[PDB]
Design a protein around this ligand. Structure first.
Ligand SMILES: [Zn+2]
Length: 28
């Protein structure tokens, strides 16, 4: 999940959470 917004990890692309724009690092 994205620690910043809760989005499912499946939603990360291009180095960013595609929901909230968090840097990749924020996925857990
Ligand atoms: Zn996010």
């Amino acid at each position: 999940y994205c620690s910043d917004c809760g989005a499912d990890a499946s939603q990360v692309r291009g180095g960013y959470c595609t929901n909230c724009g968090a840097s990749a690092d924020r996925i857990r």
